[PDB]
């Protein structure tokens, strides 16, 4: 009744198609327990969102570098950023660690007990900072969005998870062909468009001995 990851395959019993992007691909039987199922859903959502954010930032920086603006490569960007950054190394990572620890244990204890942070303990807000779904919060994180409508929310969930998986593939592609070519992903794309019949993953010397 659903398009699976392989046509004619047997979908898992714990994957009933009620999740976003539920293509029934799970050969290692992970997320079988419902608590770990929720934990895997949360982990996939946050890894997906960070993959899309990092891929978008990498693409924007590489496009700006290709257009002539002074921008670093997606690799060693922070290495040449810190020497001009007023914030030194050490303090920056620790500040982001403290702040992200605050946000992430807040959302962690929201995951453990849904609606636990909607009691007004954090600056007296009740409707906000309360989880609407498994890996989907509400209140502050939906300023104008159409999550009120159920069908549009489901379509946006499917779009978000598919874009997330595409961004994971994009990030592994980024690191792989950066180690292959030592060039920007936009430079690799322009090389592929310029000479598709010869420039590829096979004629780079490395990865094809």
């Amino acid at each position: 009744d659903r398009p699976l990851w392989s046509p004619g395959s047997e979908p898992p019993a714990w994957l009933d198609g009620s999740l976003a992007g539920d293509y029934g691909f799970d050969p290692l039987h992970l997320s079988e327990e419902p608590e770990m199922r929720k934990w895997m859903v949360q982990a996939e959502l946050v890894h997906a969102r960070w993959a899309m954010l990092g891929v978008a930032g990498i693409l924007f920086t590489s496009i700006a570098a290709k257009t002539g603006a002074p921008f670093p490569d997606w690799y060693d960007a922070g290495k040449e950023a810190i020497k001009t950054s007023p914030a030194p190394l050490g303090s920056l990572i620790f500040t982001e660690l403290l702040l992200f620890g605050w946000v992430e244990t807040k959302r962690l204890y929201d995951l453990r007990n849904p609606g636990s942070q909607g009691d007004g303990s954090f600056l007296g807000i009740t409707d906000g900072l309360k989880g609407k779904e498994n890996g989907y919060p509400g209140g502050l994180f939906d300023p104008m969005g159409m999550s009120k409508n159920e069908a549009s929310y489901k379509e946006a969930k499917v779009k978000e998870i598919k874009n997330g998986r595409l961004a994971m593939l994009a990030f592994v592609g980024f690191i792989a062909q950066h180690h292959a070519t030592h060039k920007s992903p936009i430079d690799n794309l322009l090389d592929h468009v310029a000479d598709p019949f010869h420039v590829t993953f096979a004629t780079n010397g490395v990865s094809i001995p």
Binding site: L4, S6, P7, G8, F197, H198, A202, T203
Partner: protein, 230 residues
């Protein structure tokens, strides 16, 4: 007529005019229904998978035996230019033997294209072998109607696999089955030959045919085993 040279007894007792082959040549014995008895998919030694792999090996041998000798006589003639007309093992399949430099892409690029396309093809084939007709239910670019298949996963048919769709009668279909399996069993020995001839002479098979034709005694097994490169 019937049977063959090997033709072990207690092997013709489970095959008599049923399979498209069934010439009685099972000296070792691998189509016994007692083999791989029980439940589940199990192993590869079973009559269904053996017939499936035999016809797949057969058709692949037909395609290979056509493609190995096809550029050669046409290169002797003026059909294809002699620059492209090279021996089948010098096209890039064995780079120690030789590659064709004047291709539109790298041989590994063509290898990746072949890997993607035939991985799609063979994985759909395997998934339909596990679940008959299950590739006509999952949406695939709007062409699900030609992947319905038949009761035999080896012989799917349909709007595309049999687009000529002749042989509707059982007798003509059985004759076509016997013709396919017999030409495939010929292409078996054709590939076995072509490989052995390539390793014993270093030249192409039609050149070996010309050598046997011009001088049968001077160019045969005994002189070529004692010659250079083998």
């Amino acid at each position: 007529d019937f049977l063959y040279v090997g033709s072990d007894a207690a092997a013709l007792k489970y095959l008599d005019g049923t399979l498209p082959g069934d010439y009685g040549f099972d000296p070792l014995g691998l189509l016994d229904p007692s083999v791989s008895g029980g439940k589940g998919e199990g192993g590869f030694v079973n009559p269904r998978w053996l017939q499936y792999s035999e016809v797949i090996h057969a058709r692949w041998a037909m395609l290979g035996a056509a493609g190995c000798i096809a550029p050669e006589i046409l290169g002797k003639a003026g059909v294809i230019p002699a620059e492209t007309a090279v021996d089948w093992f010098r096209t890039g399949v064995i780079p120690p033997a030789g590659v064709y430099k004047n291709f539109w892409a790298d041989p590994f690029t063509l290898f990746f294209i072949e890997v993607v396309a035939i991985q799609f093809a063979e994985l759909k084939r395997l998934q339909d072998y596990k679940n008959p007709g299950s590739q006509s239910r999952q949406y695939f670019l709007g062409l699900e109607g030609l992947f319905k298949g038949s009761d035999n996963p080896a012989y799917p048919g349909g709007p595309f696999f049999n687009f000529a769709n002749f042989g509707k009668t059982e007798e003509e279909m059985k004759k076509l089955k016997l013709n396919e399996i017999k030409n495939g069993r010929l292409a078996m020995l054709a590939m076995f030959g072509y490989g052995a001839q390539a390793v014993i002479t270093g030249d192409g098979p039609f050149d070996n045919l010309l050598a046997h034709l011009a001088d049968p005694t001077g160019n045969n097994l005994i002189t070529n085993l004692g010659g250079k490169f083998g």
